Structure formats: structure tokens, C-alpha cells
Amino acid sequence: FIYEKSRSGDITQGLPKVEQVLEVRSIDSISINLEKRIDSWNERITRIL
Amino acid sequence: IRVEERLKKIIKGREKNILKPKAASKMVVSELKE
Secondary structure (H helix, E strand, O other), X not given: OOOOOXXXXXXXXXXXXXXXXXXXXXXXXXXXXXXXXXXXXXXXXXXXX | OHHHHHHHXXXXXXXXXXXXXXXXXXXXXXXXXX
């Protein structure tokens, strides 16, 4: 039998989450959104100006 | 682009015309776009 539960609030959620975001080992705080923006800027800098 | 390809390898004739005829960035900063 397999049941899906439904927790998954988020992996780490206390001191360890704060430690993870503060200690930027890989930029993955909100990089599902932030990394996209950063890469887009770094590729779009070359423009008319 | 093809002009750049032949200009890299020293000089081999090809004095056809002034194909580039361009300016260098015009020192312009337009805000919105284009």
C-alpha cells in the first residue's frame, strides 16, 4: 500500500533554515525565482545603453 | 560576419567596398527601449 501523506511544509524550518539561507553555499534561498532573475540580468546587461 | 572571418587571417585582397560603415555606440542612454 502507498499513501501520500501531506506534510511537506518545507525541508528545514528553524535554525537550520536560517543557517542555510545565511550561509550562502549555493544560491538557493528562493532561487526557484531569484536565480532566474539574476541570470536574466547577467545575460541582458548588453543592450542599447 | 564574413568580413570579420577574412580580416582575422591577416590580409587577402578583397577591397570590394565599405561594408561596415558603422558608429561606435553613439554614447547614448535611452531609458525605455529601442
